[PDB]
Amino acid sequence: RKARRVQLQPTEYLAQHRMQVWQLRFKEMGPPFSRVWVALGGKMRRRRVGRQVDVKDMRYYWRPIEPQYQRLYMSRLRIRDHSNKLRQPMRLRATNADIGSGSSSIEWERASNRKYGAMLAPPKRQDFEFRVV
Amino acid sequence: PTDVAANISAGAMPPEANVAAALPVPRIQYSKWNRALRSDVYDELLKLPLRYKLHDFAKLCPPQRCQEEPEAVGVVGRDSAVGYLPPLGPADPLDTIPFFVHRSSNGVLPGKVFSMHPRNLMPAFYLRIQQVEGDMFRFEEELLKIFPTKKIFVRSHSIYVYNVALDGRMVLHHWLLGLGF
Amino acid sequence: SSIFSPRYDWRTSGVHDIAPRDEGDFLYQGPQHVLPGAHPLPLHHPHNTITRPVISPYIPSPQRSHPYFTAPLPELPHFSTTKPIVYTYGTMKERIIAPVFNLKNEVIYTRELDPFIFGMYPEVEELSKNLTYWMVRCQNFASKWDYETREIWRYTWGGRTKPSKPWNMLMPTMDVKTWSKSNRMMLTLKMLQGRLQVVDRLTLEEPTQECYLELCRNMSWDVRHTGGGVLFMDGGSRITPSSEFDRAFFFGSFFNGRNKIVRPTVLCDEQYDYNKTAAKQRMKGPKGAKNPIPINRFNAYDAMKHDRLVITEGALMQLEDELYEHKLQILPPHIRNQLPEYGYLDSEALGDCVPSLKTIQMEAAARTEEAESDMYKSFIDNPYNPWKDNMDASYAVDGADGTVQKFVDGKKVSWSMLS
Amino acid sequence: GAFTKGRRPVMRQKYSREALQAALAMVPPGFEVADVPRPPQRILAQSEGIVGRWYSNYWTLHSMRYQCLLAGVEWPLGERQRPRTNYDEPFFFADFEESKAIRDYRSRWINVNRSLVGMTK
Amino acid sequence: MSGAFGCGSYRSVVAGTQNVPRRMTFYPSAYELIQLHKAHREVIRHFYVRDKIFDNKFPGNALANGLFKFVPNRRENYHMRELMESIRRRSIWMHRIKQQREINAKVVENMEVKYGKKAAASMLCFTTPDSNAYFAPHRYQDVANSWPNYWQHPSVNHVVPKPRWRRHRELGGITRVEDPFAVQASDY
Amino acid sequence: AFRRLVKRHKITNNQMLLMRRREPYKPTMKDRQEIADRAKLEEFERKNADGLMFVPEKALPPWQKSLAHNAKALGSRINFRGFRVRVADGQDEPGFPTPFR
Amino acid sequence: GGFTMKYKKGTGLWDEDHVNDYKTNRYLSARATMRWYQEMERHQTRNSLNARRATQSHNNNRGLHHTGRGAFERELERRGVQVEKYPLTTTTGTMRVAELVILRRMELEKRAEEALAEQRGELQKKNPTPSEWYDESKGPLNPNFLRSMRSHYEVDIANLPDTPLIRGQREFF
Amino acid sequence: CGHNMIKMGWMKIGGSWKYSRGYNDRRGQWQERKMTPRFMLAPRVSAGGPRNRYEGKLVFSPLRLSKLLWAIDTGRINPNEVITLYHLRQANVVGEREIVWPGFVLISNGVRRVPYPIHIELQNASAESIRLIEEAGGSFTCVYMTHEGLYQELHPEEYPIFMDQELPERRGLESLATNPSKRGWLTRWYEDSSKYAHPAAGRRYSHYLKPTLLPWHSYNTA
RNA sequence: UAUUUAAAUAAUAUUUUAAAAUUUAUUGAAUAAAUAUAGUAAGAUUAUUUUAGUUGAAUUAAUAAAUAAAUAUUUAUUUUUCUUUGU
Ligand SMILES: NC(=O)c1ccc[n+]([C@@H]2O[C@H](COP(=O)([O-])OP(=O)(O)OC[C@H]3O[C@@H](n4cnc5c(N)ncnc54)[C@H](O)[C@@H]3O)[C@@H](O)[C@H]2O)c1
Ligand SMILES: [Mg+2]
Ligand SMILES: [Mg+2]
Ligand SMILES: [Mg+2]
């Protein structure tokens, strides 16, 4: 007769898999077909006062991460739109093309806001009589 | 094909050529927006045996003359930085080319290099030409004569050449320009 | 069964009766015997000229590129194309002239076609794209509903985990480029097969159905279900083209047979999708384009299902006017830089040429604009002359206010935006 | 976005030039645009058109100021803010709310010039 | 702010960029003419959509024939939002094309006063062999083969196997072919 | 026994039944592993036969090229010879004379 | 509810444009086509009339006229002053425009028919014999088209010999 | 028509499901055996991270001078009129997808000489592009616009009368608007020192430099 | 800071039966909801006649060291040699 009917299921976030942890630790570099995820070298460790008195050894250099970890992270990005092999994986950091395509679709051709990086641009100068109860 | 690093190690060249052994010679790269013609590859194409005659590089290159003209006009062939020129046509008028190659809207040549299974970011590339009109098989045979060892397929819409990069797309564009399309 | 299967030929006797019939069965005389239906090429549809009549100057032959004329006949008035002829990447590269017909089954005159519209040589990939999109869109998506385990209340009765749902089903999105390309290729395929007929008008003396049937009988239009169907593209006529259909013929064309009238257009609206991320839960209908193509458009499926294609001269004019800008934009630059030289881009808006022929509705709208243009005179937001005081203005950058303002003769003209 | 007045029109009535002059005729003398303040963000931005006491409505007042600017009708009322360019009378004013001292043209003119001369990059 | 008319915007005006005596180059404005044609078509279409009238041919929905297909409020909003902006875009295109036509006339006069009539006529011509191809292929059949069906080009027309056909009447006016078939291979 | 469903090859000769291993001439797992290791070592020694050649700033890996360029772009504005910026990351010292050096 | 492109709904040239129709079928009979057109027109009219009734009831409940113009606008209309900044063309004007366009089209059709009949008479009295198009060098003619063109000539055309008659090898009639 | 079984290839339906792990996978430890997390091994260079696109970072979209020259030689853009972002978008030399605040950067890639003077208005043009345009004779003007200014430039038809546009932010002013090297559009206003003396004199005017459109006409040929 | 070559703007989903009592209420241990969730125990998962590689390896928590190996899908290098060789 009548029971609990199932409705449409909401989709996940388009940038759900990309992690701020990765965006803070690593960064992507290189040509499009030879991208490498690199993080700064050195050993991070907290020790007592009086250790590593010489600073010349501590170097700020970037070394690439292991290829298996790079493949795992890239696959985490590749999760979205898996069936279309003709679509290149997403990027660790969103680019200008991505921010533009976020609203360049024809379903956003009427909205004046959200266009040309409204959320990215700093706010406008508010009115001088601006006040809230 | 000279190994500058090996020559420097053996003592046949001066040790100041390490930059030459490491980095290639700086040249304006051929692009879809900057037709940087390469005289060496064009001479190689002229030396290669083909049935159709190609125009001279002097006519393929845009003219470079004095720029004292006060106002510019709409000449078909004028000074251009990116090296854009209308199609010159066939080299010998008393001939019939079995195929015709149309350009795109921006005047770019049909050569487009894609990748096989690009989701995995695969380095293996291939070239697709989908603006050839006329006898596609004559164009395919000319591509055979150009790239002997490559796999070249043909369909009603596109001609595919597998295992060729931009380094082959530029050769294809050079041959097309020399032919006159 | 399958060809390479043992179960394919275990029925070794009894399939046929040893005794033949006495009315239809006959013996093979020899090589000089003409068997009914025998043909060397595999023809799943063995229709011939008599059964499926083609209406064209010549029967489509391998010597002729297209079965229609190639040069205007000196004993018939020739009508050039409304818009100038350009040969694009896919055009047949040959002149095409169709013998326009009248409502009395008589050739009136000869009108030249457009190779961009009726010269784009067909291609199986695009035809299949069109056919697949149409056959996947026309299916009813509201009847795909199914039960689920949470919807079944007390296995056989317990529904499946992932059942088919009207919202879960997909409705694809097709771009206007491929749509127009496939429609043009289908029109060219009909032209090549020689089943395209151009009529001046599609008008009935009475809006009833018997007058429609009498017209079809007089001009030998087979409309029966079993016979070859008809696909009309009504657009009015050459002098008075109309986007809408003629009322009398549109009322009379409702016959049980195989005849379908479609809108005189080959393009389509750009399909939008506002539920791409499944934001609105209570939406009912398939995912994808929420603005599908209506049924009364020209399509590969209906074109294949209906034998003859009868296009009107009004439809021809409308198609040419709609595809003019497209076939002009497709051209490469070293070709399109010569259109104003040859006179192809003489726009009547600048006053270069007299306004060209337009449809009834478009002419009405244009006259409405011409009459309403008088009200936009004493206002600064006049659309026909916007910002008519820039070169006589003075821009001042007031830093205390942090704004750039437009003063004229010492008076502020710029308007401060309200929030 | 639909509640407050953000990028959105509030009056959907567009009158002719003669109708604006008739609407501005009912304005009582001694009125000024600086009297009507901007309503807070917790108030709906609606306009009832040209009705009685329409000048009291902040959104209706300035919207009428925008249409006359397009039609070229001389705005009889003043401006929303009167800038103080030169030191004149009164040479001192009284304010118990610390708003007039900040909104002064000269008070913010020196602040912008402070940031302009402060750039040293 | 007049960046649409082709001149410098108010930002350039404030910057004081001297770009007025810049240059006078000939320009065909073909792309601008195409865009003007598109804008004119769009304006006419917007007017036709705004002037829609209910024309119901069925008796059930017959009580609407006199009304507009829009609610007057939405009709006013449409007129102010899209129909009035299409005209502004059309005017922008027309102004740009008129400025370019003025500059073209000046360049034509300069070429006529410098080189000569026929010299200017040849210098301001864009005709190319591929242009002759695109505009008239019959003057290009000899130069190259540009047909989608290359086997029917008159250069390669010899390949089409023209058969000996005949119309038999005993079959009902049916065209058949006279030459015999070829014995196809059957087995190994 | 890592793969637990062995391949069944087409039997062209009856001795393919008696044979167990697919490629008999091919060395076993560990033997071919150490063989490939020795071959890679020999190739690396052939590559490092000559001295470690130093590369300019353009012919550097991406994680060092931009850093080395920005460390000296400040001095690149003033064209004067004899200006070195001792950067941390870069090609390490070989420790012996080199013809490229 | 939610967001839906109401600005796109009602913008197409016909009623069937910009409507989410996912309940149709690949083949529609005569009754199916009539019901489809009926449903589209009825959907459009329902939307329009429901919106109009809603807004008029809201105006009447707020106390304004059914159009939406208040007492000030009514007093201006009494005085005679134009209330609208841009007076849009009305139904009578649009119908008059359509009528005059139809009439001009009919007159042009009559004149074109007269001129075309004159040219037909001229060309028929000039050319009694079929031109070079009546050839069989490339393909066979179509008997249907020949029977249709019969009326334009004096000599019978449908009488076709079994041999592919060519212009050069044999004289025609 | 088959199952893509991991470590086993492509198997037919109804085959051996015994040695199957792709099902459990769809439903490494040997690398994490030593408790070595990659996300905790390397430290963070900053709280925001490398290449953090914060408000005001001024991440421009690349626009190749070679591409611009190609478009001009093609005929999409008219070199007579001043080049602007609106003209670019209308000539369709750049699609709408590449547009994002801040507008563009003029990159001179693969160009060594500009034969004709080009008068273009963009943001944060490279030094080589600026000097090439200056050598050719054209005049570049860096127009760093705010968000509303950029929207008004891209869609001017939505604005019948000029409106008060707010000046850019402090970072934009100190970087591009008031930078003589980048040829900003406020460098002259910033160099003008008379505005600092008196507030009434602070207002600086500027005028255009100097050397209807009704589509219906009359049949004058008769 | 910008002196280096490309590209088919498309997202929606992802086994099944089960391995556990806490939940939210009602009626005097039963009643009705929960595909709620178990690092996830265990099983079942529908389609012959096929056309090419390895059959016990790999195993370095953590500053500048050439490289983990197996299994499987796609995909690439025709150079010499007396024959052979799945890189
Ligand atoms: N963010 C924004 O504020 C924004 C965005 C896009 C366009 N605009 C345009 O800016 C202008 C002023 O905006 P605002 O926020 O200061 O006021 P507003 O748009 O909120 O109000 C303007 C008033 O004038 C009327 N009006 C608008 N255009 C008119 C025209 N062409 N003719 C006659 N009356 C007209 C409006 O309906 C309203 O009554 C308008 O043209 C508006 O469309 C503003
Ligand atoms: Mg995240
Ligand atoms: Mg990996
Ligand atoms: Mg392997």
From TrEMBL, chain A:
Keyword Metal-binding included in the entry's annotation: yes
Binding positions for Mg(2+) 2 per the UniProt entry: 68
Keywords, in A-Z order: Metal-binding
Residues at which Mg(2+) 1 binds: 18
Protein name per its UniProtKB record: Uncharacterized protein
Part of the whole protein covered: 49 to 181 of 181
From TrEMBL, chain D:
Binding site for NAD(+): 5, 11, 14
UniProt entry keywords in alphabetical sequence: Nucleotide-binding
Keyword Nucleotide-binding part of the UniProt annotation: yes
Domain of life: Eukaryota
Designated name of the protein: Uncharacterized protein
Shown segment, full-protein numbering: 62 to 182 of 242
UniProtKB/TrEMBL annotation, chain F:
GO cellular component terms, A-Z: kinetoplast; mitochondrial large ribosomal subunit; mitochondrion
Origin superkingdom: Eukaryota
This protein's name: Uncharacterized protein
Source organism per UniProt: Trypanosoma brucei brucei (strain 927/4 GUTat10.1)
Automatic annotation (TrEMBL), chain G:
Taxonomic path: Eukaryota, Discoba, Euglenozoa, Kinetoplastea, Metakinetoplastina
Name the record gives this protein: Uncharacterized protein
UniProt organism field: Trypanosoma brucei equiperdum
Chain positions covered by the region annotation Disordered: 117-139
